[PDB]
């Protein structure tokens, strides 16, 4: 996260860290949507251009974390993956269209003050909150700058941007399964997700029922926190049908 701030304790209890077993390292961010399901970006698990193609056994998910590198004894919980599910129409060849994936845990994780699931939006929630100007929150343990690593989870609030503006900021083809967020140059304020933040959640707190909803997933960007550029996120609601089908199994 570039130009963000240290998260408060228990501020993002659904935050999940995808951890690589062998070379123990940070693989991506993710989110907890139930005691047995974790949501993340498809490119965190599958991305042929970089020869990335993880299997259930290549990684672990660490839930309830704050510190990036420390093993948080008595607080974080480490889970193994039973199965990975990548959206069948995930477009890694061109623009990361439908950049979403699900991971089923071998055993349900126990909720606590630091481990709690985030809500997934319904049609009305999406319709009412996904508006240009409305701010969401992005969290992650990724790079603090484009070109280092944070000590603890970082957080930044960013406004959703009008589709025309998102489109005119890049050469990449944008789809309805994406939305972009970030401040414009004339708005002064800054902030963006960066390398390592992939798969993390873009959340919004409903002013109607005061619950947190995950509206997006950190998907892609060109550089980090560059003027005239924006971060792009997977449109969670647009792909909820797939999510429900997988969970319903």
């Amino acid at each position: 996260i570039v130009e963000g701030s240290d998260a408060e304790i228990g501020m993002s209890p659904w935050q999940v860290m995808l951890f690589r077993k062998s070379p123990q390292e940070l693989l991506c961010g993710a989110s907890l949507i139930s005691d047995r399901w974790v949501l993340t970006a498809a490119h965190c698990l599958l991305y042929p251009p970089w020869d990335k193609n993880f299997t259930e056994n290549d990684l672990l998910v660490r839930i309830g974390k704050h510190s990036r590198t420390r093993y948080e004894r008595n607080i974080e919980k480490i889970s193994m993956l039973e199965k990975i599910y990548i959206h069948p129409r995930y477009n890694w060849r061109e623009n990361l269209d439908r950049d979403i994936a699900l991971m089923k845990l071998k055993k349900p994780v126990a909720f606590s003050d630091y481990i709690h699931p985030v809500c997934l939006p319904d049609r009305e929630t999406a319709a009412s909150l996904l508006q240009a100007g409305y701010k969401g929150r992005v969290t992650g343990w990724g790079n603090l700058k484009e070109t280092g690593q944070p000590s603890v989870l970082q957080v930044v609030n960013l406004p959703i941007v009008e589709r025309p503006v998102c489109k005119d900021s890049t050469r990449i083809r944008i789809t309805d399964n994406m939305f972009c967020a970030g401040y414009k140059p004339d708005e002064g304020k800054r902030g963006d997700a960066c390398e390592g933040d992939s798969g993390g959640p873009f959340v919004m707190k409903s002013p109607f029922n005061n619950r947190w909803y995950q509206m997006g997933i950190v998907s892609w960007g060109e550089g980090c926190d560059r003027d005239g550029k924006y971060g792009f996120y997977t449109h969670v609601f647009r792909l909820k049908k797939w999510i429900q089908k997988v969970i319903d199994q």
């Binding site: 951890f19 123990q24 390292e25 672990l60 660490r62 590198t69 093993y71 480490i78 193994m80």
Partner: peptide, 10 residues
């Protein structure tokens, strides 16, 4: 630079 995690997690 990550702290080693319990071996019980493989």
């Amino acid at each position: 630079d990550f702290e080693e995690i319990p071996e019980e997690y493989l």
